[PDB]
Amino acid sequence: AICKQRGSMAGSTGVHDTVVNQLLSKIDGVEQLNNILVIGMTNRPDLIDEALLRPGRLE
Amino acid sequence: STAMNRHIIVDMEKAESLQVTRGDFLASLENDIKPAFGTNQEDYASYIMNGII
Question: SS3 letters for A1-51?
């Protein structure tokens, strides 16, 4: 629901577009916290951006 | 991880005390099964069912 492909989101820029750019900023973030696992779940994974799904972020 | 799992293993599900180990030619296995490239490639089975006589 919240995360989907940028540039195609409810028009060009998108309303849901800024949350993911924080999420990415934290998960592989510059602080390199090492103590979290994120468990996500969907019925439509193709919508989900590789950029969030790529290894290290979600392996 | 795949190399450990042998030595890893219920109530306890103990982690064994054995310390002499390393992943050896398991990078091949995980290569085959575990990761998506991110750029799709190497899926010609649907194209190649029987190889070539």
Answer: CCCCCCCCCCCCCCCCHHHHHHHHHHHCCCCCCCCCCCCCCCCCHHHCCHH
- Cβ of B35 within 8 Å of Cβ of A50? The answer is no
Exposure class string for A39-54: b at 16+ Cβ within 10 A, else e: eeeeeeeeeeeeebee
N-to-C CA span, chain B: 40
Interchain contact, A54 vs B38, CB within 8 Å: yes
Chain A environment of B38 (Cβ under 8 Å)? 50, 54
Chain B, nearest residue to A50 by Cα? B38
Indicate which technique resolved this structure: cryo-EM
- B38 close contact with A: CB closer than 8 A: yes
Per the rule left: phi > 0, alpha: psi between -120 and 50, beta: everything else, B25 is left
